[PDB]
Amino acid sequence: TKIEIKTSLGSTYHIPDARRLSWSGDWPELEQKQLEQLTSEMAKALSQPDIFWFADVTASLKTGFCQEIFPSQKFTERPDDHSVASRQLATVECSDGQLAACINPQKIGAALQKIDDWWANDADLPLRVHEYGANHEALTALRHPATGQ
Amino acid sequence: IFWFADVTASLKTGFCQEIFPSQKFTERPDDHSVASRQLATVECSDGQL
Amino acid sequence: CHDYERRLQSLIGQSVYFRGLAWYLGRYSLVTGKHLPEPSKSADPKSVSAIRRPGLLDGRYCDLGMDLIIEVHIPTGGSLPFTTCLDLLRVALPARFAGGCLHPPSLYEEYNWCTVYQDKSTLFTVLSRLPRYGCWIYPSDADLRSFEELSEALALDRRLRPVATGFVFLEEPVERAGSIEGQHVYAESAIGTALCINPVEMRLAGKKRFFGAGFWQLN
RNA sequence: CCAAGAAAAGGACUGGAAGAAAUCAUCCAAGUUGGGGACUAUUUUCUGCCGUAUAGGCAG
DNA sequence: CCCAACTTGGATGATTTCTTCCAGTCCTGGTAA
DNA sequence: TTACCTC
């Protein structure tokens, strides 16, 4: 997997191979460095007004012969017809009129904000930020009101 | 037992003798442009029929 | 138009005011289905570690591609027609539109998406070049007082569409507990109409009709 | 100060079995394309020598 | 460059259109005593 | 702490 980023300030970043970068650990040289530079652009954008910033993120995937792809799924009613699909996938209309597979904005978003490893003084894996510390995999909550957290 | 046979025959013919291949099953046309009797063919790997 | 005006006004010391706003439609795609709400509601207030879903609504959503032509006016005799102001016009641009998310054209193919004209002849000439499959939306003249009158008007034309136009008051503004800011009033939705005009029709109508009829305002 | 402000639809699959479109059938008759004409112009390739020599090499 | 561009007689007959058994869930409401 | 209902 290769990742490439351009921004409105003229910078460009390139990860030659993203498959090994962990949450916890230390990155290889000429990768750790790009993380520092990107951090600076964003740290500013987040807090100082009157700066226009805009980013364009592309990636490439090397695949198998006929590999299956997993786009976002729609939320639906059960059809009563038996001629209508029970599992329907999300697509986007292209400028030429054809449809293409896509991933929804809020699904990209939920991934980007998965940064909370501040709970219970034991980092584990990070959670999607939520007022109550919701844990979807275990169907529970890590900052239950009863704890004061 | 994986048994195969390969059968070939040769026909010695007349000068321009007519040949009788299989016909297709069709419905009565009304366009007056399509043949009323249509014959079955195959396509070769090079495009010839 | 107004949230955009307020943001720009906090950046430029001079008074800036928007008389009119125009709307053009290049792409319109209907999206099926409905959004799932975040689990923001505890199943029980105390002694329970289960999270419930607030409820579900049935709405309709779409993706747009559109251009805007805003009539910008500066009260002061001396104006600021400079690169600095073009940057400030890019910064002031809101991120929210019609409940959805608004973005500029993609970076890898960027051109000057934020130009300014002080000539009707140059601006109209460039606008006549737009693709034939798009729509300009114009204000209508007809007065309708019922759905039956609307049915007849829509049967006769092919360019006429109903639109939501604003609100009609049920009472005079008063002070009321729970108001976000100042006075509060109840209202019912106002249903009105508009026309859909092809780029080919204004190539022929001329700049005179376009700048007289093609711009919308409040009141 | 945009029916305002925030939102992860996710998980599992094995439609298979058999088959025969045939019989005949005829596109014919005549027919008139046809009379005229500047590619050379303000262009460059001219004069001697070696050599049995319209071979093959050199000075202007 | 310049002038023309075609009439006519006609366009099918027989009988048949298949079968077996199935059709999944689960989390997602206010209101009162 | 319990149940009651829209073609």
The resolution in Å comes to 4.0
Number of H helices, E strands in chain C: 6, 9
Task: Round to whole Å and give the CA distance between A59 and A1.
Answer: 7
Residues A53/A7, Cβ–Cβ less than 8 Å: yes
Buried b (16+ CB within 10 A) or exposed e, A96-108: eeeeeeeeeeeee
- On the 0-12 / 13-18 / 19+ scale of CB atoms within 10 A, C51 is buried
Task: Round to whole Å and give the CA distance between C67 and C113.
Answer: 10
Residues A58/A13, Cβ–Cβ less than 8 Å: no
Q: Which residues of chain A neighbour C47 with C-beta distances below 8 Å?
A: 146
Task: Round to whole Å and give the CA distance between A137 and A140.
Answer: 8
Q: CA distances (Å), C122 to each of C22, C106, C116, C119, C211, in order? A: 17, 26, 11, 6, 13
Return the residue of C nearest to A56 by Cα: C107
SS3 C193: strand
The secondary structure of chain B in percent helix, strand, coil, rounded to multiples of 5, reads: 0, 5, 95
The secondary structure of chain C in percent helix, strand, coil, rounded to multiples of 5, reads: 25, 30, 45
SS3 C81: coil
Residues C21/A60, Cβ–Cβ less than 8 Å: no
The residues in A 31-90 lying below 8 A from C, measured between CB atoms, are: 50-52, 54-56, 74-76, 88
Task: Round to whole Å and give the CA distance between A121 and A130.
Answer: 17
Taking Cα atoms as reference points, which of C104, C95, C94 lies closest to residue C6? C94
Chain E bases having any atom below 7 Å from a protein CB: 11-12, 23, 25, 27-30
The DSSP output letter for A132 is T
C161: Cβ contacts below 8 Å, ≥ 6 apart? C193, C194, C195, C196
Reported as half-sphere exposure (CB side, CA atoms, 13 A), residue A8 has a value of 15
DSSP H or E stretch at residue C180:
none
Residues A4/A62, Cβ–Cβ less than 8 Å: no
SS3 C15: coil
Task: Round to whole Å and give the CA distance between A72 and B5.
Answer: 54
For residue C54, how far is the Cα from the chain centroid?
30
Residues A127/A119, Cβ–Cβ less than 8 Å: yes
CB atoms within 10 A of CB A36: 9
Chain D bases having any atom below 7 Å from a protein CB: 1-11, 21-23
DSSP letter string over C105-126? SPGGG---TT---S-HHHHHHH
Q: Which residues of chain A neighbour C39 with C-beta distances below 8 Å?
A: 134
CB atoms within 10 A of CB C6: 11
Determination method here?
Answer: cryo-EM
Hey, is the C-beta of A110 within 8 angstroms of any chain C C-beta? no
Taking Cα atoms as reference points, which of C126, C143, C120 lies closest to residue C209? C120
Q: Tokens at residue C49, please?
A: 């570690």
Q: Pinpoint the alpha helices (H) of B1-49.
A: none
Q: Which residues of chain A neighbour C63 with C-beta distances below 8 Å?
A: 92-93
Task: Round to whole Å and give the CA distance between A99 and A97.
Answer: 7
Q: CA distances (Å), B35 to each of A71, A123, B21, B26, C162, in order? A: 50, 79, 16, 10, 56
Q: Indicate yes or no: CB of A56 within 8 angstroms of CB of C107.
A: yes
Residues A113/A129, Cβ–Cβ less than 8 Å: yes
- Could you tell me how many residues make up chain C? 219
The DSSP output letter for B47 is S
